[PDB]
Amino acid sequence: SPDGVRVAASTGIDLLLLDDFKLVINDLTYHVRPPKRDLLSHENAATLNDVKTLV
Amino acid sequence: DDVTVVYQNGLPVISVRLPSRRERCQFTLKPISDSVGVFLRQLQEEDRGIDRVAIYSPDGVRVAASTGIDLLLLDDFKLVINDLTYHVRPPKRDLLSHENAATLNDVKTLVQQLYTTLCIEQHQLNKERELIERLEDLKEQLAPLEKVRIEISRKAEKRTTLVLWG
Amino acid sequence: DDVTVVYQNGLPVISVRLPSRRERCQFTLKPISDSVGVFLRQLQEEDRGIDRVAIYSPDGVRVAASTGIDLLLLDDFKLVINDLTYHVRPPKRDLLSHENAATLNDVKTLVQQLYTTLCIEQHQLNKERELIERLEDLKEQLAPLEKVRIEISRKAEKRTTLVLWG
Amino acid sequence: DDVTVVYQNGLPVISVRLPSRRERCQFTLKPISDSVGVFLRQLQEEDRGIDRVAIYSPDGVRVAASTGIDLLLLDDFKLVINDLTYHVRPPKRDLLSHENAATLNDVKTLV
Amino acid sequence: DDVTVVYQNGLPVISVRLPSRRERCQFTLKPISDSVGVFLRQLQEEDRGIDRVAIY
- Determine contact, residues D27/D57, Cβ cutoff 8 Å: no
H-only helix segments in A1-55: 13-16, 43-54
Contacts of residue C149, defined as CB under 8 A and 6 or more positions apart, other chains included, come to none
Helix ranges (H only) for chain D are: 36-47, 69-72, 104-110
State the smallest CA–CA distance between residue B154 and chain C in angstroms. 37
Rounded Cα distance between E49 and C35, Å, is 26
Select from D52, D14, D54, D11 the least CA-distant residue to D36.
D54
Q: Rounded to 10 degrees, what is the CA torsion of A35, A38, A39, A41? A: 90
Rg, Å, chain C Cα set:
31
Q: What is the DSSP string of C30-99?
A: -TTT-BHHHHHHHHHHHHS-----EEE-TTS-B--SSSBHHHHTTS-EEEEETTEEEEE-PPPP----TT
CA distance to partner chain C, nearest, from residue A28 (Å): 20
State how far residue E21 is from chain C, nearest Cα, in angstroms.
7
- In chain A, which residue's Cα lies nearest the Cα of B45? A9
Q: Look up residue B89 and give its amino acid.
A: R
Kindly determine whether residue A8 and residue B111, on different chains, have CB atoms separated by under 8 Å.
Answer: no
Report the candidate in A50, A1, A40 with the shortest Cα–Cα distance to residue A21.
Answer: A1
Residue in chain C closest to B130 (alpha carbons) equals: C33
First to last CA, chain A: 36
* Contact with chain C for residue A55, Cβ under 8 A: yes
Query: Exposure string (b/e) for D57-85, b if CB count within 10 Å is 16 or more?
Result: beeebbbbbbbbbbbbbbeebbbebeeee
**Nearest residue on chain B to A44, alpha-carbon basis:** B107
Residues of B in contact with A12 (CB under 8 A): 28
User: Which residues of chain E neighbour C50 with C-beta distances below 8 Å?
Assistant: 20
Give the closest-approach CA distance of A37 to chain C in angstroms: 9
Method: cryo-EM
* Quoted resolution (Å): 3.6
Question: Residue B26 is inside which H or E element, if any?
Answer: strand B23-28
Please answer whether residues D8 and D26 qualify as being in contact, where contact means their C-beta atoms are separated by less than 8 angstroms.
Answer: no
Q: Reduce the DSSP state of residue A21 to 3 states and report it.
A: strand
Q: Is the dihedral of CA B54, B59, B65, B70 positive or negative?
A: negative
Residue numbers of B between 69 and 108 with CB closer than 8 Å to A: 107
Nearest chain C residue (CA) to E22: C19
User: Containing H/E element for C104?
Assistant: helix C100-117
Judged by a CB distance cut-off of 8 A, whether residue C20 touches chain E is yes
Of B129, B136, B137, the CB nearest to D99: B129
Note whether A44 and B110 are within 8 A (CB): no
Helix (H) or strand (E) holding B163: helix B121-165
